[PDB]
Design a protein around this motif. Structure first.
Motif, PDB file in Angstrom:
ATOM      1  N   UNK A   1      11.363  -2.560   6.735  1.00 39.20           N
ATOM      2  CA  UNK A   1      12.576  -1.604   6.993  1.00 39.20           C
ATOM      3  C   UNK A   1      12.895  -3.210   6.503  1.00 39.20           C
ATOM      4  N   UNK A   2      13.018  -4.558   6.996  1.00 39.32           N
ATOM      5  CA  UNK A   2      13.950  -5.884   6.591  1.00 39.32           C
ATOM      6  C   UNK A   2      13.171  -6.841   5.995  1.00 39.32           C
ATOM      7  N   UNK A   3      11.615  -6.460   5.316  1.00 37.24           N
ATOM      8  CA  UNK A   3      11.234  -6.978   4.339  1.00 37.24           C
ATOM      9  C   UNK A   3      12.333  -8.335   2.976  1.00 37.24           C
ATOM     10  N   UNK A   4      12.797  -7.027   2.824  1.00 44.52           N
ATOM     11  CA  UNK A   4      13.321  -7.732   1.680  1.00 44.52           C
ATOM     12  C   UNK A   4      14.115  -8.440   1.394  1.00 44.52           C
ATOM     13  N   UNK A   5      14.593  -8.418   2.363  1.00 40.60           N
ATOM     14  CA  UNK A   5      16.117  -9.621   2.555  1.00 40.60           C
ATOM     15  C   UNK A   5      16.124 -11.387   3.228  1.00 40.60           C
ATOM     16  N   UNK A   6      14.371 -11.108   2.752  1.00 39.49           N
ATOM     17  CA  UNK A   6      13.509 -12.052   3.548  1.00 39.49           C
ATOM     18  C   UNK A   6      13.582 -13.353   2.631  1.00 39.49           C
ATOM     19  N   UNK A   7      13.929 -12.961   1.058  1.00 43.48           N
ATOM     20  CA  UNK A   7      13.543 -13.800   0.346  1.00 43.48           C
ATOM     21  C   UNK A   7      11.816 -13.897  -0.373  1.00 43.48           C
ATOM     22  N   UNK A   8      10.875 -13.284  -0.216  1.00 42.67           N
ATOM     23  CA  UNK A   8       9.353 -13.813  -0.052  1.00 42.67           C
ATOM     24  C   UNK A   8       9.206 -13.649  -1.642  1.00 42.67           C
ATOM     25  N   UNK A   9       8.309 -14.377  -1.291  1.00 43.68           N
ATOM     26  CA  UNK A   9       6.868 -14.218  -2.259  1.00 43.68           C
ATOM     27  C   UNK A   9       5.743 -14.190  -2.502  1.00 43.68           C
ATOM     28  N   UNK A  10       4.485 -14.008  -1.540  1.00 45.35           N
ATOM     29  CA  UNK A  10       3.507 -13.364  -0.360  1.00 45.35           C
ATOM     30  C   UNK A  10       4.080 -13.358   0.342  1.00 45.35           C
ATOM     31  N   UNK A  11       3.488 -12.019   0.442  1.00 42.09           N
ATOM     32  CA  UNK A  11       3.585 -10.869   2.141  1.00 42.09           C
ATOM     33  C   UNK A  11       2.014 -10.560   2.394  1.00 42.09           C
ATOM     34  N   UNK A  12       2.229 -10.224   3.790  1.00 46.30           N
ATOM     35  CA  UNK A  12       0.773 -10.291   4.422  1.00 46.30           C
ATOM     36  C   UNK A  12       1.430  -9.255   5.612  1.00 46.30           C
ATOM     37  N   UNK A  13       0.678  -7.752   5.167  1.00 49.47           N
ATOM     38  CA  UNK A  13       1.927  -6.487   6.161  1.00 49.47           C
ATOM     39  C   UNK A  13       0.211  -5.953   7.422  1.00 49.47           C
ATOM     40  N   UNK A  14      -0.715  -7.209   7.068  1.00 49.95           N
ATOM     41  CA  UNK A  14      -1.512  -6.257   8.313  1.00 49.95           C
ATOM     42  C   UNK A  14      -2.135  -4.806   7.520  1.00 49.95           C
ATOM     43  N   UNK A  15      -2.607  -4.112   8.798  1.00 49.33           N
ATOM     44  CA  UNK A  15      -3.424  -2.918   8.098  1.00 49.33           C
ATOM     45  C   UNK A  15      -2.825  -1.762   7.183  1.00 49.33           C
ATOM     46  N   UNK A  16      -2.942  -1.605   6.103  1.00 49.38           N
ATOM     47  CA  UNK A  16      -2.396  -0.363   5.371  1.00 49.38           C
ATOM     48  C   UNK A  16      -2.778   0.773   5.817  1.00 49.38           C
ATOM     49  N   UNK A  17      -2.294   2.103   6.986  1.00 49.05           N
ATOM     50  CA  UNK A  17      -2.832   2.056   7.697  1.00 49.05           C
ATOM     51  C   UNK A  17      -2.285   4.036   7.149  1.00 49.05           C
ATOM     52  N   UNK A  18      -1.022   4.115   6.364  1.00 44.70           N
ATOM     53  CA  UNK A  18      -0.670   4.448   6.219  1.00 44.70           C
ATOM     54  C   UNK A  18       0.871   4.855   4.501  1.00 44.70           C
ATOM     55  N   UNK A  19       0.608   5.861   4.115  1.00 43.38           N
ATOM     56  CA  UNK A  19       1.165   6.369   3.017  1.00 43.38           C
ATOM     57  C   UNK A  19       2.160   5.324   2.458  1.00 43.38           C
ATOM     58  N   UNK A  20       3.515   5.005   3.813  1.00 41.64           N
ATOM     59  CA  UNK A  20       4.486   4.990   3.540  1.00 41.64           C
ATOM     60  C   UNK A  20       4.683   3.217   3.248  1.00 41.64           C
ATOM     61  N   UNK A  21       3.681   2.323   4.536  1.00 41.53           N
ATOM     62  CA  UNK A  21       3.094   1.212   3.764  1.00 41.53           C
ATOM     63  C   UNK A  21       2.951   0.950   2.057  1.00 41.53           C
ATOM     64  N   UNK A  22       1.842   1.872   1.748  1.00 43.79           N
ATOM     65  CA  UNK A  22       0.989   1.453   0.410  1.00 43.79           C
ATOM     66  C   UNK A  22       2.632   1.754  -0.819  1.00 43.79           C
ATOM     67  N   UNK A  23       3.371   2.607  -0.095  1.00 46.06           N
ATOM     68  CA  UNK A  23       4.661   2.581  -1.562  1.00 46.06           C
ATOM     69  C   UNK A  23       5.232   1.536  -1.399  1.00 46.06           C
ATOM     70  N   UNK A  24       5.831   0.728  -0.486  1.00 46.59           N
ATOM     71  CA  UNK A  24       6.042  -0.692   0.265  1.00 46.59           C
ATOM     72  C   UNK A  24       5.255  -1.970  -0.829  1.00 46.59           C
ATOM     73  N   UNK A  25       3.688  -1.532  -0.148  1.00 47.06           N
ATOM     74  CA  UNK A  25       3.344  -3.154  -1.408  1.00 47.06           C
ATOM     75  C   UNK A  25       3.295  -2.524  -3.024  1.00 47.06           C
ATOM     76  N   UNK A  26       3.312  -1.656  -2.712  1.00 46.45           N
ATOM     77  CA  UNK A  26       3.187  -0.896  -4.770  1.00 46.45           C
ATOM     78  C   UNK A  26       4.314  -1.729  -5.404  1.00 46.45           C
ATOM     79  N   UNK A  27       5.331  -1.378  -4.565  1.00 48.68           N
ATOM     80  CA  UNK A  27       6.425  -1.598  -4.644  1.00 48.68           C
ATOM     81  C   UNK A  27       7.086  -2.780  -4.852  1.00 48.68           C
ATOM     82  N   UNK A  28       6.087  -3.939  -4.005  1.00 53.85           N
ATOM     83  CA  UNK A  28       7.015  -5.188  -4.069  1.00 53.85           C
ATOM     84  C   UNK A  28       5.869  -5.827  -5.154  1.00 53.85           C
TER      85      UNK A  28
END
Lengths: 351, 353, 353, 351, 353
Positions: free
Chosen positions: C191-218
């Motif tokens: 919810x807050x990751x986009x305000x942290x100015x990332x270039x490279x992101x490690x998200x842990x396990x891809x357990x469900x759809x919502x994280x998948x949508x976040x990763x595809x947008x990134x």
């Protein structure tokens, strides 16, 4: 005290069926379907409340005053078991009491064919008894479990909302738990039943999904499980069962029915031509290899015809075929049979 | 209380499985699965209450009176452990008590052929022991536990509904988790099991798909995985496993099972012809390359035939062939075997031949 | 306190890979895969409780007592980091502890081809490293982290449950959030990751759809997204990913994946042929124009053919092809390769060579 | 106190974009996309916590200590607005801070065609601005609402998670409410907005169903409503909107879109060819009578073609057509445009 | 207290149909449809509160203050029963009260054809009396109740929200449950209704599917089930009833309704042509073999034709046909009939006659 006992005594002595207690009327007894008022003063709200409350515990009093309704059963030794319902109308207590003989009639007395009796010796599998409420189902269950109690040395457990028949010991140990008094719920009883070493289970009403899944799992682990549904036919029952599952799982449901089914019954009660009593009309579906193939071929729009034509080979019988027999024996009239036949055109074709 | 010890003594001494206590019946004991009432007076409510209450703490009195139910286990030193359940029916306390033996029977003592023993030495793959309730599955599994414990230097973890056999340490380290006390669920145990560096896993009943997916991952990650199922034959077992998945996913699942599966055992206790005791009849399917290809090719309907003909080549054995041997040895009657045979005509062909 | 430290000192000194603490056995250590008990008395519940509790905070005490499960990581300065798993057996605490070296090995030390190193320089896209739990994925991820950290002046953020590899600053700024301590959840971090100015992101396990949508947008917006799956192959990965979306929304997701995907890796760890150590077998998929077209043409059934012919052109390699190379170099046996091959007959054909 | 002020001063003075504060590293600033550490001692957990906490109130302290996360915005007068995020890593405080110029650039500076500017004077209807997060959407909204603020004497209300632009008064009265401090939630703000006499509304993220229904009802009653979605195209947006409704209600949805739609925008940010800044690529769908007929004919599988061919007549433009224009003007490369084109084959056909 | 009684005395004495109590107006009474204020001061909130509160229990006090709404009924001995509605306006209580005669009129007094009287003798089936709220449905139901009560020795149970018509014992035993006092809900009453030995049942409004399923089971099992709908015609009634079931379950419901249905009535109240009183217009559907076949043939579009031709054979009558009879007898005007006719052109054609 000894007045309710006297009213129940008059009901039995008079061959009555039901006792009605409500305000502004004398006590009334339903005899042969029709109500007769007793030559007694009318009850007031004090009378009905005092009479019904005099046979309840403080627990039952607390719960009744919490909800203003109560179903219960009780026995008078040497007389009968009884099912009671207490409720409130016009701000006053009212009650209805059904009586319950100690002796359970046999399959033959009930007009049930020998295959159900031979089914009562089955050690595993799925047996379905369906029909509307009060269609004689509890009587059938009591007869079957008394047959097992008589013939086997196994453990029978019943869970009841309330108990509709008392089964003291014959050759089995039978334990009967009433929901709402002895245990909090069906779910709480089911949390412990596998630690109670059962072989045969009576589960009461098929109230919800989770209980269906629990009972099916119990059923596939080598036990004989009895349950009820409010469906009126074998085909309607199978359709009801399949359509509750996700679409992707209907093949598995098709596979499950193909694996576990040993019998499907669907029963109803018709008025006797004599004017006294009711008679069972019953549809029976028993899977044969041909039916298992039909299951494999994904055809439910042809199973009804297979049960219609498996009479001579497998002892199957549609509801209309049973009604036909009842008409030939003149137990029911032609008009009643046609008015309750699910397919009058098919009976016309058979005629 | 002081007689209760004797009731459990009679249960143990007679080799009974379960004691049933309820009013208006004598105590009844399950022997070889069937109840026999003891020659004692029926219990009344005073008797049953005093006996059940004699083993509860005051906190247990509070809890039992709060719920009218209690599951528990307890031991009597020098005798046995027991799992007890106390509940209320017909307005009175009733109880059922199952015994927990200290002694594990051996493979040879059970009449099990050497191939099960060689399967217990497999470094990896999937091994399934299936059948109805009380068909000896937990005892068999516990025997394989102790055999590995004796012979290997590996890690034993159990996931259980409830805990049955107790394994102290021999050559392995053994940790035992009871569902509902030690862990919240089968699911939670599988959530943490991979972080416990296992070699050997007991998962309890393969109750649903998610655990099956966990088991396939386990089987493909270098472990020997044991699980139970309630099926009555090999074909029914494979069909049940495949048909849980959507049709479109059955090809990958079938390929995985075809790759990692090393043995499927389905066992049933049958009444002895002597009328005292039971004997295991068991069908064994061990995959060969042909069987693995048929699993991959979605042709279930002929695998039984490979088992029907894999006796000479691979040591495979259908249920009927085991029953045939038991009948030849006169352990069971012909009528009982035919009554439980899924295909009596096959047995007739084998017999007339 | 200084006893767990001494046990861990013995663990390091003996080249052990895990410490086990449970009741009725002394502590036992795995050397070359096999357990050896230390010359100490067997532990009781008091022992296990004091030892396991010595590394927990008070809120961790409440938390372990609340869940009876705990995965965690912690470091001991000048020695090592550790991954811990705590559970309960026989009513007492038990623990397993794996150790975590300070020095992360490079791609070439792991036997990884040059394309992963070229992948660490990608400005954008989606990179997937898959395989079951503990199949070496995190070590590869830590190596890629260290490569970017060494070469770029960019922002690396990891979200981990728990933090495994520690990464100090090289050329990057690294922020690492542990779920359950640093952040409430993966969802809250996203919810807050986009305000942290990332270039490279490690998200842990891809357990469900919502994280998948976040990763595809990134991955579509110019970021490097790393994610994991517990799948074992490229085809299995794509099918798992596609089938979670509604059928009407499957076209857009196919287009997104076809656009942003730059690499999919699927690992497995096999015992080495010598009997000491483990060797990485990995299937690598790098999308070429033909595969992206196959995505557009809805011909997933043909991706295997593209995987069958993409060795020379794109540097792709099926799991069997990597196992083949390990086989020609005699790094693994034929039995392990065949027992692991998704198509043993194909592996046979390659073994013609 | 004066250190954070100096850090932000150095960021502006050095033409920086973002300030990063975390333990075991000196303060670092992102310049032209690349991070550079300052010649300062490394921070510890005490440093990062003290620095971030020094500009928060006790209520922000309570909330952050309750959740360990906080988004906020703040201004330094005569310098800039700022968007801040504070979080925790390795048990220590960390922070990222983005700076926000006081002057919003115009449509032509942003490369936006004149039709969006003519759309900013519309009194009512539905305007959609879609694209992924941080695609320049907030900048577009600030430019449009400054245009309205300059030109109209109306009431503008914003609800923010947080405020991304401050809009002091020009010709309108503009009230801006920050979610999580001034008001409990979007829902609580929406409970009172109709009693606040608004004409134009900025609603923040379209986070849930109920809010969509509230906003559409608001938008139908004669107001200009701005909202965002995370969709990437007009067609994907319409499909997303329709499929959330029951199938039986999709005709109504088809009717609503046919009635209320006045413009659909979907935007993305591509790296500029120079290597500094990002450039907008935009797909624009404006319904014409022909499109309204296509709506009436229940064809969504041909609307994309109508927007592809409504360029000369209605000023429409696909994402690929915009990438084409960016390629001819050399703002983006051909490889980036093709790797980003939702249909590279269509762009091939145009070539 | 004795003031509300005096107001009600004036209400009865003047032949009024309703008493209205609200602030800033004196009590006003409707005479022949038109309001007339009583020669009293206008009420304030204190007045309305004391008057409305004088007929509530403490339960009811808490309840009205909890919901600001209340429908109820009550009786004043030797005078009349009343239906009350209480609500709030300008922060003060307001009330409307309709009166309820002790004597229920007969079918013939209401102008109802002999078939409803023959319907009161039916041993089994489903009878529906429909129309909007306050369209005279309850009066018809009370008349049918009184007919059965007079002629049968059976059990009549009513479930009402609130109790409207009071029925004392004639030949039947009558139990009447008011929702919110006698029983928690319609659902709760239906949970216990089968244990109350009924022959005839009044269930109140048919608000949802669950009550419909209860009623269909009752109607199929040999009971007389009465229910209401707010529909205005037979076709509208059948379509409303059918469309609530899933498409796959619509066949069974069609069969059930086709089997058990014995009558459907749909009422409307029209102002009389003289300008005083109201006259009942009712559409009556009695299933014949053709309609039951139309149900079986899935040709609902043809039921209107069966309704168009079933006057002579089955005693059926469309709403327009009843209005036609009222028109030939000059009971209603042409404008009211045309403004109410579901097909004014059909009514025109009949007005050729």
């Amino acid at each position: 005290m000894a007045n309710m006992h006297q009213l129940l005594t008059e009901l039995v002595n008079r061959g009555g069926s039901d006792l009605h207690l409500t305000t502004n009327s004398p006590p009334q007894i339903r005899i042969d379907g029709k109500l007769l008022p007793l030559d007694m003063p009318p009850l007031n709200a004090v009378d009905t409340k005092q009479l019904c409350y005099s046979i309840l515990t403080e627990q039952q009093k607390h719960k009744f005053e919490e909800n203003n309704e109560l179903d219960l059963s009780f026995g008078i030794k040497g007389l009968s078991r009884f099912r009671g319902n207490v409720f409130v109308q016009r701000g006053a207590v009212a009650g209805v009491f059904r009586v319950i003989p100690y002796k359970i009639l046999s399959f033959e007395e009930l007009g049930l064919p020998p295959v159900v009796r031979e089914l009562a010796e089955k050690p595993r599998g799925l047996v379905l008894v369906t029909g509307p409420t009060g269609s004689g189902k509890s009587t059938t269950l009591a007869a079957i479990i008394d047959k097992i109690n008589t013939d086997r040395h196994e453990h029978i457990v019943t869970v009841e909302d309330p108990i509709e028949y008392l089964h003291p010991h014959k050759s089995c140990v039978v334990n009967q738990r009433e929901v709402g008094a002895d245990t909090k719920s069906f779910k709480n009883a089911l949390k412990y039943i596998l630690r109670q070493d059962p072989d045969v289970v009576l589960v009461g009403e098929l109230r919800d999904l989770e209980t269906i899944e629990a009972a099916l799992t119990l059923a596939e682990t080598g036990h004989l499980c009895f349950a009820t549904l409010h469906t009126n036919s074998a085909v309607q029952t199978i359709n009801r069962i399949v359509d509750v599952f996700p679409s992707y799982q209907q093949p598995q449901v098709r596979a499950q029915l193909s694996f576990v089914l040993e019998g499907v019954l669907s029963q109803t009660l018709l008025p006797k031509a004599s004017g006294t009593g009711r008679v069972l009309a019953i549809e029976v579906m028993v899977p044969n290899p041909a039916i298992r193939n039909l299951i494999r071929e994904d055809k439910i729009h042809q199973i009804y015809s297979q049960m219609q034509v498996g009479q001579e080979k497998f002892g199957m019988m549609t509801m209309n075929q049973c009604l036909y027999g009842l008409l030939q024996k003149r137990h029911i009239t032609m008009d009643v049979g046609m008015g309750r036949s699910p397919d009058p055109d098919e009976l016309k074709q058979m005629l």
